[PDB]
Amino acid sequence: ISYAAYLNVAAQAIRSTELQTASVLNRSQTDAFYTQYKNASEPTPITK
Amino acid sequence: MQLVLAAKYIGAGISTIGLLGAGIGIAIVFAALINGVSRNPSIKDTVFPMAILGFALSEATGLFCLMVSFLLLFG
Amino acid sequence: MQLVLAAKYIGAGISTIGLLGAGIGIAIVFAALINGVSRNPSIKDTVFPMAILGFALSEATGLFCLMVSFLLLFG
Amino acid sequence: QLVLAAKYIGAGISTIGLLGAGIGIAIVFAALINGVSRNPSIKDTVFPMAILGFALSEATGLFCLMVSFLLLFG
Amino acid sequence: MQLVLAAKYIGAGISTIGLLGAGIGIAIVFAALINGVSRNPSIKDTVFPMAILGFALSEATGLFCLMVSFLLLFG
Amino acid sequence: MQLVLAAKYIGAGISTIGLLGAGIGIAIVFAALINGVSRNPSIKDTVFPMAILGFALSEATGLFCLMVSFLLL
Amino acid sequence: QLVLAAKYIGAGISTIGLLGAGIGIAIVFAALINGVSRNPSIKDTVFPMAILGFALSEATGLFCLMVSFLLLFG
Amino acid sequence: DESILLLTFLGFTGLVAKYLAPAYKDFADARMKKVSDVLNASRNKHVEAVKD
Amino acid sequence: LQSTLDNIQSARPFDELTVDDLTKIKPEIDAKVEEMVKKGKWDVPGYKDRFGNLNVM
Amino acid sequence: LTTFSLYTIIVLLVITSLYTLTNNNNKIIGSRWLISQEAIYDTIMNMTKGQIGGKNWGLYFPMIFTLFMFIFIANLISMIPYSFALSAHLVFIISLSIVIWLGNTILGLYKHGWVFFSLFVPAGTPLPLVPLLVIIETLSYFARAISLGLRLGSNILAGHLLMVILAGLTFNFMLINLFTLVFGFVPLAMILAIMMLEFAIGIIQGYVWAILTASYLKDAVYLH
Amino acid sequence: MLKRFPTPILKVYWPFFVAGAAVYYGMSKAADLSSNT
Amino acid sequence: KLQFALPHETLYSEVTQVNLPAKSGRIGVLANHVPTVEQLLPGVVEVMEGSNSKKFFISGGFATVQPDSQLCVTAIEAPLESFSENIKNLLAEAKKNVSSSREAAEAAIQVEVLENLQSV
Amino acid sequence: MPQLVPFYFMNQLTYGFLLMITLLILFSQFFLPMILRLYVSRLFISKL
């Protein structure tokens, strides 16, 4: 866990009164899978 | 009796020492004021009444030394 | 009487010790000023009035001590 | 005689007062060094402030010294 | 006779007490010097003559105490 | 006689008090040295001479108090 | 017997001086612990320096003590 | 008594001639040079303007 | 202009010059000094940006 | 004649030579002695433009310069071993301080009317202690009266007296048994170090005078 | 070399001079009283 | 001067007093200030250019007075008014969440935000 | 002592206040404006 991870969570919290816009909502929702590779080898594409 | 009259005047001088503590106290409050104002640029409206209160209370203790001094000196 | 006159000269000395406290105090306020002004160079104009108020009050405790000294000296 | 003894003794007592001033002068100069080292560039504004503060610190000590002199001489 | 000579020796001893504050003072200036120089790596050339000035001034307060001690001790 | 000899012994004792300030003074200098060296690391080669200078000057004030004790003795 | 009284008194007054060294010593070791805790690694350089200062601060207290014994014994 | 004070005063002037007089020489020289350089520079500058 | 160039070349006391020669060539020198003394502003403005400040403070 | 009268003449003659025998007939480039009095001129010009900083700062720029130079020369003359002070005749310096202080008080009264006593309301503060702060501002206002003179006076007088007492001790140090004549240079060096220090505290004091009675002049010309 | 450039000093330094005369007079009397002893 | 900049905004990328909540407590920067780098904690921010003041609710970031008097403030997303009741309800749920489940720290940060929100 | 308490005060003060007025006029009208001239002269050549 990182300092900027703390800030990330805060930014997500900040997109919570109700006066919000789609671009804001999009900036806090994203889909990705970090596929931890290995030496060829590769642990699964575990969701980010 | 010469001893007793001298004792009154002496006791006053001893009491005068007590003032020094209040003197250091006054400075501590104002030093804090200066440091704080540098932090905020703007806290001073809140803090200044607190500072005056703090000053008065510290000063009052100094005055307690002084009144004992004058009781001995004059009285 | 030799004893009473003597007592004034001893007692004056005793009184003089108190003044030291205010002296340290004056320095403490000024120290804060220097550090404060360093920390925000533009605070200087706001803080400098506050500093002079604090200087006078801190010094004042020393003055009261010195008055009692003069009462023994010239009493 | 007793009065003359009292002058010399009394004078000694007054001298303790000077110690506070000695500490005081240093506190201003320490702050000068701290301020200068902190900003670099504050030096020209702060240097006259510091000398003034020094002078005032010295003044309380001077008064202690003068009471000492007054008792010594009479 | 004995009393006056005695009185001179006593007063001198008391005067020696005055010096201690100046001693501590010299150290305080040097402490600031070390701490400042360690902060900048580079303030030192400007700050060093300033530091010497502060040293001299602090020392001088102690010199005054000492000379008063000498006046009482030697006469 | 008695009063003067007594006064010499007493006066010497009072003179010892002046030294305490120098003792504390020396400690402050070394504390600063340690603080400086811990803060920078690398400043040390310049800073150590400065510390020695400050030490010497602090010691001198105490020395004056000490020699006055010896004179009274 | 005034002189004998004074001899014992003189020792007592000298004992007061030691209080300052007690504080002083602690300040040197306080600095050691503070510095060492911030760096970790500074400790090996700093410990010789610390011991030098420790001895020096103490020595002043030793002088105050030395005069106490000197007075006491004569 | 005061002849001891005169020995110290002789010592004081000896230290001055060692330390202060070369520093003050260098300082004085430095300023003189700077004034001269400014003066001659302005003179050069106006000679350029004549050619223009 | 040839004459102007020659005049700067054949008169140029650039080594040393007395301020009296400047008072003689311009009463502006003594006038400005007097006006500053009369005004009670003894600063020479712009003297600090082409000559030293020579401060200690 | 009178030693004091003779030394007042010596101060005048030193000061006359410093703006005559220091450069020939005005040479623009500058002559090495006059470089000093250029720097002094500028650091007090830019200092009292820094202090009072009015448009009458330069009207008190000569005054602050001759308060500098008087103290600056009279703490070199008194530093000569066989010499009789002017400044360490306290009665002139303290009297001079009282003259300047009264000339500030009158100046303050002239400049700030009968609302001069508003100077002794230091700042807007609670009203039940506004009168207290007039009493213990005025007390400090004439503690300012004597501090300025007596600071300088005490430093110079005490410095010379310290040197002379140590000289008298060192006379008898070098007139007693040969183990005391071992390390005979060390008390001479100690007195020399104090003599070096006594120049420092006198030259700083001339600056302290001139900044402090600039701070007082700041108070006197402009309210606060 | 030396040249007089008039500086207004009468209108500037009158309160200083008034104070000087008063202190001079008071110190004249103080000096006479101190020279008795 | 001042730069109040964000990835998707450049609010105040002149400015006279800025009031910031920082790891050093709360900090005000006014004209020349010492050249610092301080990480801004999750914040309620006021920026004043003249007497006019604009209020931002800020996700924390970093603050840096530059020695050229450029106050670089960088943060992820800000207006105070946009941020701020329904959010208080959601945050209450999030407070519950810390009980059950890095997620503990995340929910803890959410509670911190709730405190900051309560400040608004 | 003579260097401590004399009683020669009015004698002293007469010669003292005379020296001050002498230096005041002397600096102010003569020696200071001759420095101000050096500055202005340097600047006039600098300007030209």
Curated annotation (Swiss-Prot), chain I:
Signal peptide annotation: none
Subcellular location as annotated: Mitochondrion; Mitochondrion inner membrane
Transmembrane spans: none
Domain of life, source organism: Eukaryota
Self-association state and partner proteins as the record states: F-type ATPases have 2 components, CF(1) - the catalytic core - and CF(0) - the membrane proton channel. In yeast, the dimeric form of ATP synthase consists of 17 polypeptides: alpha, beta, gamma, delta, epsilon, 4 (B), 5 (OSCP), 6 (A), 8, 9 (C), d, E (Tim11), f, g, h, i/j and k.
Family listed: Belongs to the ATPase d subunit family.
Function, in words: Mitochondrial membrane ATP synthase (F(1)F(0) ATP synthase or Complex V) produces ATP from ADP in the presence of a proton gradient across the membrane which is generated by electron transport complexes of the respiratory chain. F-type ATPases consist of two structural domains, F(1) - containing the extramembraneous catalytic core, and F(0) - containing the membrane proton channel, linked together by a central stalk and a peripheral stalk. During catalysis, ATP synthesis in the catalytic domain of F(1) is coupled via a rotary mechanism of the central stalk subunits to proton translocation.
Miscellaneous notes: Present with 6820 molecules/cell in log phase SD medium.
Name assigned to this protein: ATP synthase subunit d, mitochondrial
Organism: Saccharomyces cerevisiae (strain ATCC 204508 / S288c) (Baker's yeast)
Native organism taxonomy: Eukaryota, Fungi, Dikarya, Ascomycota, Saccharomycotina
UniProtKB/Swiss-Prot annotation, chain K:
Cell compartments where the protein resides: Mitochondrion membrane
Sample GO molecular function, one term: proton transmembrane transporter activity
Bilayer topology term: Single-pass membrane protein
Transmembrane segments: 9-25
Protein family per UniProt: Belongs to the ATPase j subunit family.
Extra remark beyond the main annotation: Present with 6540 molecules/cell in log phase SD medium.
Entry function: Mitochondrial membrane ATP synthase (F(1)F(0) ATP synthase or Complex V) produces ATP from ADP in the presence of a proton gradient across the membrane which is generated by electron transport complexes of the respiratory chain. F-type ATPases consist of two structural domains, F(1) - containing the extramembraneous catalytic core and F(0) - containing the membrane proton channel, linked together by a central stalk and a peripheral stalk. During catalysis, ATP synthesis in the catalytic domain of F(1) is coupled via a rotary mechanism of the central stalk subunits to proton translocation.
Keyword Phosphoprotein found: no
GO biological process: mitochondrial proton-transporting ATP synthase complex assembly; protein-containing complex assembly; proton motive force-driven ATP synthesis
The protein's assembly and partners: F-type ATPases have 2 components, CF(1) - the catalytic core - and CF(0) - the membrane proton channel. In yeast, the dimeric form of ATP synthase consists of 17 polypeptides: alpha, beta, gamma, delta, epsilon, 4 (B), 5 (OSCP), 6 (A), 8, 9 (C), d, E (Tim11), f, g, h, i/j and k.
Name by which UniProt lists this protein: ATP synthase subunit J, mitochondrial
Swiss-Prot record, chain L:
Subcellular location: Mitochondrion; Mitochondrion inner membrane
Annotated Gene Ontology cellular component terms: mitochondrial inner membrane; mitochondrion; proton-transporting ATP synthase complex
Primary subcellular site in the record, as a coarse category: mitochondrion
Keyword ATP-binding: no
GO biological process, one term: proton motive force-driven ATP synthesis
Protein keywords: ATP synthesis, CF(1), Hydrogen ion transport, Ion transport, Membrane, Mitochondrion, Mitochondrion inner membrane, Transit peptide, Transport
Single annotated GO MF: proton-transporting ATP synthase activity, rotational mechanism
Family of the protein in this entry: Belongs to the ATPase epsilon chain family.
Subunit structure: F-type ATPases have 2 components, CF(1) - the catalytic core - and CF(0) - the membrane proton channel. CF(1) has five subunits: alpha(3), beta(3), gamma(1), delta(1), epsilon(1). CF(0) has three main subunits: a, b and c.
Role: Mitochondrial membrane ATP synthase (F(1)F(0) ATP synthase or Complex V) produces ATP from ADP in the presence of a proton gradient across the membrane which is generated by electron transport complexes of the respiratory chain. F-type ATPases consist of two structural domains, F(1) - containing the extramembraneous catalytic core, and F(0) - containing the membrane proton channel, linked together by a central stalk and a peripheral stalk. During catalysis, ATP turnover in the catalytic domain of F(1) is coupled via a rotary mechanism of the central stalk subunits to proton translocation.
From Swiss-Prot, chain M:
Principal cellular location given in the protein's record: mitochondrion
Pfam families: Fun_ATP-synt_8
One CC-aspect GO term: proton-transporting ATP synthase complex
GO BP term (any one): proton motive force-driven ATP synthesis
UniProt key word Transmembrane: yes
UniProt keyword annotation of Chloroplast present: no
Keywords noted in UniProt: ATP synthesis, CF(0), Hydrogen ion transport, Ion transport, Membrane, Mitochondrion, Transmembrane, Transmembrane helix, Transport
Membrane topology summary: Single-pass membrane protein
Any one GO molecular-function label of the UniProt entry: proton transmembrane transporter activity
Compartment(s) where it occurs, according to its Swiss-Prot or TrEMBL record: Mitochondrion membrane
InterPro entries in alphabetical order: ATP_synth_su8_fun
Ranges that cross the membrane: 13-32
Domain of life: Eukaryota
Main function: Mitochondrial membrane ATP synthase (F(1)F(0) ATP synthase or Complex V) produces ATP from ADP in the presence of a proton gradient across the membrane which is generated by electron transport complexes of the respiratory chain. F-type ATPases consist of two structural domains, F(1) - containing the extramembraneous catalytic core and F(0) - containing the membrane proton channel, linked together by a central stalk and a peripheral stalk. During catalysis, ATP synthesis in the catalytic domain of F(1) is coupled via a rotary mechanism of the central stalk subunits to proton translocation.
Oligomeric and partner information: F-type ATPases have 2 components, CF(1) - the catalytic core - and CF(0) - the membrane proton channel. In yeast, the dimeric form of ATP synthase consists of 17 polypeptides: alpha, beta, gamma, delta, epsilon, 4 (B), 5 (OSCP), 6 (A), 8, 9 (C), d, E (Tim11), f, g, h, i/j and k.
Gene from which the chain derives: ATP8
